[PDB]
Amino acid sequence: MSVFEARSSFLDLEQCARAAGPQRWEAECQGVRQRALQAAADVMSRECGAYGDSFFQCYRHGFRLEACQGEKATMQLLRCQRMVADRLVP
């Protein structure tokens, strides 16, 4: 749920994957995978929830507001998600 915990989750995932192998990883390492994805998802929602709520609001108001003009409402969210991923998975 924290960035540290998610990083440790992904390290668990990668080391258990190197243990298992390229052939049986999806079979053997499902629980660690789900835990890692859930932690990364918590991190993503925490760090990108403002932009998601803003997109939701613009969608309710039909993108008629000032902050909805252009494409920033979408690009901000995508940039937050890309940054979070680049920070977590590699």
Binding site: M1, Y59, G62, F63, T74, L78, Q81, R82
Partner: protein, 108 residues
């Protein structure tokens, strides 16, 4: 690299555009919106007949999410509206059966 997210946001933008064009009486714009609505998605096409026959908790989850995003009841007579609703529901069904939804605020 983010196809699910991208197509979701595009669908939402096109729904808003359809509603706005209907309010402003613009058949050209709203037909453009209908045509631009990601009908060429193999995942959603495959999940459509699965959604049409699902039942119980998964169906209730997808109905809850669709009523969140689009609570207005579409006219039973307008097939374009019906079809866009079906497409969005199939997309949500695909996302849920890949990674289920967690809709409660209480969670850990």
């Amino acid at each position: 690299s983010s196809p699910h997210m991208d197509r979701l946001l595009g669908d939402l933008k096109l729904l808003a555009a359809y509603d706005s064009a209907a309010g402003w009486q613009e058949p050209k714009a709203m037909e453009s919106a209908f045509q631009s609505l990601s009908w060429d998605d193999a995942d959603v096409l495959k999940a459509l007949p699965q959604y049409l026959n699902c039942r119980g908790e998964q169906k209730r989850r997808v109905d809850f999410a669709y009523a969140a995003l689009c609570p207005r009841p579409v006219d039973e007579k307008d097939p374009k509206q019906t079809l866009m609703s079906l497409w969005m529901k199939a997309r949500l069904f695909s996302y849920d059966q890949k990674h289920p939804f967690v809709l409660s605020p209480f969670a850990a």
